[PDB]
Amino acid sequence: TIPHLAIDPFSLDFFDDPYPDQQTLRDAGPVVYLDKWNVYGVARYAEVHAVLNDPTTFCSSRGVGLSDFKKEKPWRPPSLILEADPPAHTRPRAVLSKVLSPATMKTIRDGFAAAADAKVDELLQRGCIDAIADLAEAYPLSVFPDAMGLKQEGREHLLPYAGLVFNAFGPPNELRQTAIERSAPHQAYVNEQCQRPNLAPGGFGACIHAFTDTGEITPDEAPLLVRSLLSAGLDTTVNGIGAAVYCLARFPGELQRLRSDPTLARNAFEEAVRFESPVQTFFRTTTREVELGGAVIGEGEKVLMFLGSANRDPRRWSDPDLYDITRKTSGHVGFGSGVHMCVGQLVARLEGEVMLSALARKVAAIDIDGPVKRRFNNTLRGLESLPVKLTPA
Ligand code: HEM
Numbered sequence: 389t390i391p392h393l394a395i396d397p398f399s400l401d402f403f404d405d406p407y408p409d410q411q412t413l414r415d416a417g418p419v420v421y422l423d424k425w426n427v428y429g430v431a432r433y434a435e436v437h438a439v440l441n442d443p444t445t446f447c448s449s450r451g452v453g454l455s456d457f458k459k460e461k462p463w464r465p466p467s468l469i470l471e472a473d474p475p476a477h478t479r480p481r482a483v484l485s486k487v488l489s490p491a492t493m494k495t496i497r498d499g500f501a502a503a504a505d506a507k508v509d510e511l512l513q514r515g516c517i518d519a520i521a522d523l524a525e526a527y528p529l530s531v532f533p534d535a536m537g538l539k540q541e542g543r544e545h546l547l548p549y550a551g552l553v554f555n556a557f558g559p560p561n562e563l564r565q566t567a568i569e570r571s572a573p574h575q576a577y578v579n580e581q582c583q584r585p586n587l588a589p590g591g592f593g594a595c596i597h598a599f600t601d602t603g604e605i606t607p608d609e610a611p612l613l614v615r616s617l618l619s620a621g622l623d624t625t626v627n628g629i630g631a632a633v634y635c636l637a638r639f640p641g642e643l644q645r646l647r648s649d650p651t652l653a654r655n656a657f658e659e660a661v662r663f664e665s666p667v668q669t670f671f672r673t674t675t676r677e678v679e680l681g682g683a684v685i686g687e688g689e690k691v692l693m694f695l696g697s698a699n700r701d702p703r704r705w706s707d708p709d710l711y712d713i714t715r716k717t718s719g720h721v722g723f724g725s726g727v728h729m730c731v732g733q734l735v736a737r738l739e740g741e742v743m744l745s746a747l748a749r750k751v752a753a754i755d756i757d758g759p760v761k762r763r764f765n766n767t768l769r770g771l772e773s774l775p776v777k778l779t780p781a
């Protein structure tokens with residue numbers, strides 16, 4: 389009843405161009421079985437959304453990667469938020485929600501915007517730049533580590549650590565095995581910066597530790613919650629901003645519309661999150677026998693959700709393969725959906741908005757003028773290098 393497919397969604401050929409294989413996954417049926425990894429797969433919007441919004445049946449406490457924490461040891465102590473289910477998930481989630489709250493965005497927006505304008509000004513002086521290293525990476529590195537309260541020393545471990553985290557969600561292929569092999573120095577750095585004395589006053593890290601006296605989290609929970617932000621808070625925005633710039637570079641008509649109305653910057657970034665879906669996939673584990681799209685999935689089964697495929701499903705989206713900065717993007721699953729929906733989405737949207745605003749006001753054209761190189765990761769979709777020429781407005 390359930391179709392069996394041999395597609396490996398974690399192969400380099402798949403990363404290089406996933407869209408034909410994602411249509412195959414969608415059109416094979418609402419639920420498929422991936423023989424390569426012995427997991428179920430859902431690639432249509434409907435089933436992805438349903439799984440995300442039934443955390444009781446499709447749990448996260450057994451891991452959101454391929455590995456089932458009930459069968460294998462996690463490569464690192466489980467996240468108190470990402471790899472937890474209600475009710476244990478609830479209070480750690482509340483603390484991060486308040487640490488990254490709408491009121492908190494008011495305290496950082498001016499500095500984030502100023503750093504975005506300054507970066508674009510700097511890049512326009514050079515003209516020809518790498519939109520990845522020099523923009524998508526450089527800008528988040530210039531605001532987020534400081535917003536965390538990290539010292540300057542050792543920040544070079546942050547991106548390698550994040551690449552490891554997102555590779556570790558994948559199956560035990562070479563990408564994952566090699567990442568874990570090289571992980572020891574990055575884990576040591578990150579874990580040490582999570583301790584209260586190492587987080588500067590007023591930053592996200594110190595604010596997490598400050599919540600340890602309300603009864604929502606205990607002092608011994610704060611380090612791992614800082615670890616969450618150091619895991620998910622940087623490389624995500626790198627690939628989100630990278631996606632947005634890549635879209636504007638490929639679709640000059642949409643850059644011209646953005647220039648004509650810079651207030652579209654926020655929706656232009658949201659559309660880029662849907663269009664590229666930098667965070668591609670996550671797993672759930674069934675806690676009971678469940679019926680999903682006519683298939684009966686047994687207990688203790690892994691279910692792979694194709695977020696990027698759901699965001700291009702023609703059953704849900706009109707012209708899904710078009711980048712449209714005025715599209716009604718509400719409902720896309722690029723940030724997830726439900727109780728685990730990205731708790732840092734306000735930070736991600738703030739960074740994306742202010743950067744796209746700077747480009748909208750300062751840049752007249754974005755022209756690819758060199759070889760485009762893709763970066764391969766078991767969970768993240770994005771570029772290694774994006775040579776562009778920036779023409780000033
Ligand atoms: C374009 C940028 C980003 C994207 C596309 C993204 C994507 C996602 C997705 C899809 C989830 C759901 C995971 C699941 O359902 O299992 C998630 C959760 C999460 N994200 Fe984001 N994220 C981004 C930026 C950020 C930032 C900036 C932060 C922190 C500053 C962050 C921290 C988190 C955390 C802690 C969770 C776990 C939430 C929970 O389990 O309740 N992310 N993110």
Ligand SMILES: O=C(O)c1ccc(CCCl)cc1
Nearest residue numbers: 467470615616619620624667
């Ligand atoms: O709590 C964490 O350590 C964690 C949370 C979310 C993510 C992926 C979000 Cl795109 C990775 C790690």
Ligand SMILES: [Cl-]
Nearest residue numbers: 464575578579
């Ligand atoms: Cl760690």
Ligand SMILES: [Mg+2]
Nearest residue numbers: 702703704705
């Ligand atoms: Mg419809």
